[PDB]
Design a protein around this ligand. Sequence first.
Ligand code: HEM
Length: 184
Amino acid sequence: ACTKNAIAQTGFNKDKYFNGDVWYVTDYLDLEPDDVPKRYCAALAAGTASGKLKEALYHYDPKTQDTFYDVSELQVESLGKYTANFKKVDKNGNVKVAVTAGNYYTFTVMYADDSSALIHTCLHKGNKDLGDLYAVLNRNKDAAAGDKVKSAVSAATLEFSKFISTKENNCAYDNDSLKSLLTK
Ligand code: HEM
């Protein structure tokens, strides 16, 4: 179940966030913690591709080796708040699971600057969801969370001390695939 109406950043700068580049998840918190593993790797690219707002996602469970990519088309609900479809793809954008009614996620950018961000997502796959999931992002896959994004976590009435870090998993990412998937 999802329980939060995440508030988007006041003055969110969409062009900077959706610039075609990659964001790495450094830390995450699911309010239903058993919905996601305790060890995980994830990243995304976000950009406009031929006028369309897109995300490309990467998930990797470093223990099981379970790997999947997704291409998402985003619709705007309000500034910084989106509803996204998704199709599961290989790293080259070939479709494994097509866009499907009922497979979507909400995506809210609660805070962002040029290097760091705090997002909320509620994933739905038909009648199931994956709980309220918060993620701390950085442009640099190895960056420790600075005071700015930790402050945003506090401003959301959360505590960064409770987030689970992705940093001790040897995560390695295919940035080229994520960039190219924006077009697919
Ligand atoms: C737009 C940051 C993220 C977004 C938007 C997101 C979105 C998604 C989407 C769209 C799927 C379904 C993929 C498919 O079946 O084709 C998915 C699955 C999954 N995500 Fe995330 N995710 C994000 C971050 C994470 C993180 C950080 C964790 C735990 C850094 C996580 C754990 C999972 C798990 C375990 C699944 C599998 C669910 C299942 O088997 O039903 N995700 N995610």
